[PDB]
Structure 1
């Protein structure tokens, strides 16, 4: 589903051409849990931004579900992200004055404006909140009234919202504790294995990378090696 061919991403700081991704080659299978491991600076997040269609590779070529995103105009690019990708992050990113169920409704508003009813949005939003294994009785609560763990479960239901086959997570458990951090992981595993979601998680903590079928070790902008752990 996600595919890369000779991607490079440079950052011109003037006289300093810095390379974040160098001649990187990858191919993520549909419904495959993959993890990008590396220290701060490896180029992990840069890659999560390109695959997420948040950025353009200074070379190479990105394929999302076999579709070359490179030349797509911003409008078309936004159609990709909103339909083909589900985002999650370390920084929860919830709106402070919206109920857990409202934060899940937003993406659905932006995709289906004027098509779906308030009743249908409230329903889908809950299905995704229930799917993200957050008790229904916590739907009406706002951000600061939920455990940091419950908060990530909201970012997850919001990402699952418009039903994207892809889910990218950037150091999702960085903000949590080992115990709840594992539940979230066990949750991405659930989605991938059962629901069939193509999960790609970026991390520096190897313990998280182990939930992936394969870890892709990234070093100073380049892929040092790959590690297959399961599907033999």
Structure 2
């Protein structure tokens, strides 16, 4: 039954199983095909690949915005469609390369999707992890300032830093980062991934790091190289450099 599941215990074991996909406005153009992998909790899994390989598409399918045209997208061995949409939203947090923040305050941006009301100490905490706290404080009303009443247009890094704070404060089981730290400062890029890798609270949570930046991908527990809508190969940084294929060619080229 659709939208019937909302378990007390959520592990966060994501699996794509022989997943194929095409957008419904272009069904005769294959984007994904034979896509199979498992994202384990307690691991930061990197998803790297060239332009048009279908990384953002995989992120869209994992958020349950689209159904796969073939195969299955499983969460704890159960199709995403069977999970309640709000429950899924409370357990899974997704952050894009260009996050939409307009129409609310910075507080409301960070406290987005939460049932409970977080304290300032909670809000500042997650904002300082993403490097959002200092420039937000620079605005007239701080976190209470509306997006658009800041004085000037926010940079892509600044929007990402806020959208990352939203993801962190929710305490999700599945964290999806679709180039979510691309415009961020080089230090803040690694500070965020250090938290996700080293901290004990994320040691029981699943993290999907989609990125084309090699310095980010090499620090993941596990790397998935996407090519032609499917996984070319996978393993650790040093494992892929051992034999030589899709990943090694990219490292040597760049």
Per the TM superposition, whether the score is higher than 0.5 is: yes
Q: Give the 5 Å matches for 1:149-228.
A: 149-176=157-184, 180-194=185-199, 195-196=201-202, 197-228=205-236
* Ranges in structure 2 where 5+ consecutive residues have no aligned partner: 1-12, 240-254
CA distance in 2, matches of 1:10, 1:172: 24
CA distance in 1, matches of 2:24, 2:67: 14
Contact 1:101 1:129 survives alignment (8 Å): no
Aligned with residue 85 of structure 1, among 84, 89, 92: 92
CA distance in 2, matches of 1:57, 1:157: 30
Contact 2:45 2:222 survives alignment (8 Å): yes
Contact 1:7 1:59 survives alignment (8 Å): yes
Match of 1:72 in 2: 82
* Ranges in structure 1 where 5+ consecutive residues have no aligned partner: none
SS in 2 for 1:31: coil
Q: Give the 5 Å matches for 1:29-68.
A: 29-64=40-75, 66-68=76-78
SS in 1 for 2:29: strand
Per-residue deviation, 1:29: 1.1
CA offsets per residue over residues 26-65 of structure 1, 9 Å max, x none?
A: 011102111111111101111111112222111211122x
Distance 1:35 1:210, change over 3 A: same
Contact 1:153 1:184 survives alignment (8 Å): no
Match of 2:136 in 1: 138
CA distance in 1, matches of 2:24, 2:109: 37
Aligned length: 214
Per-residue deviation, 1:148: 4.8
TM-score norm. by structure 2 comes to 0.72
SS in 2 for 1:26: strand
Per-residue deviation, 1:206: 2.5
TM-score norm. by structure 1 comes to 0.78
Contact 2:36 2:230 survives alignment (8 Å): no
SS in 1 for 2:41: coil
C-alpha RMSD over aligned residues? 2.8
Instruction: Point out the more displaced range, 142-151 or 47-56.
Output: 142-151
CA offsets per residue over residues 111-168 of structure 1, 9 Å max, x none?
A: x2xxx45xx4655434433454544783515455666544322111111232102211
Structure 1 residue runs of 4+, over 6 Å off? none
CA distance in 2, matches of 1:89, 1:182: 20
